[PDB]
Design a protein around this ligand. Sequence first.
Ligand SMILES: O=C(O)Cc1cccc([N+](=O)[O-])c1
Ligand code: NI
Ligand code: NI
Length: 257
Amino acid sequence: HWGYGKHNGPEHWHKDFPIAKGERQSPVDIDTHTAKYDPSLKPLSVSYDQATSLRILNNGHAFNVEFDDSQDKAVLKGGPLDGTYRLIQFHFHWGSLDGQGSEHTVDKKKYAAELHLVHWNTKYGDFGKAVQQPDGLAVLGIFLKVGSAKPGLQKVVDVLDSIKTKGKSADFTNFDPRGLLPESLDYWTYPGSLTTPPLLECVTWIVLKEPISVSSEQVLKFRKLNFNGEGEPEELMVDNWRPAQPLKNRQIKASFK
Ligand SMILES: O=C(O)Cc1cccc([N+](=O)[O-])c1
Ligand code: NI
Ligand code: NI
């Protein structure tokens, strides 16, 4: 019964999941000066026109916006990827304060939040099988800074009062995740892991260089969510980020000079 506290947070997870101390754990600090520009990288293709959002769920650690992943409706290809990766969900990690919240850091800078668009490799047939493979997932990561509002985020923010507590869900159809992307698709990439238990080393990370801007008011609404279930003491869902882990024997590659 893991979480983000003193007693059950990141620094404890290794007792249940020894892979927490593995060779390709995420997130990491992105040292921009040492990431190498890679010309082998094929261009990134985000094809979200046919996306079908279905539901938003408070899973006790975050909220997930879930998609129909039963066809190639919203897919990621190119970049560092071989093959086609299907969108299953997106989520965020965020802080108690604007000065922290992201999982990846950029030259040690922490952003207020980080958006993760999670995709699985269609060669493995479903998500559950894909997470068992070293190239099973592709996560597109987007930093959030506090400034102007992000108009395409407001639909997500407004429904959060309906899923305040763990295990609550609500219908969430017709949401277009294209409205959460920055202008540029320049990126860094490296091999890593999921960042909660079970910490599986199945992710090709693709972290965009350009953050999106969200308003103070939008991020404040994330911080009104609860880790707890209804009828349990209130514990605000904040600081649901794992800190940076050792890079070990990995290289971060840049798609841009
Ligand atoms: O890496 C995370 O944010 C934790 C996590 C946990 C379980 C599933 C996830 N997913 O990518 O579907 C992500
Ligand atoms: Ni547990
Ligand atoms: Ni994540």
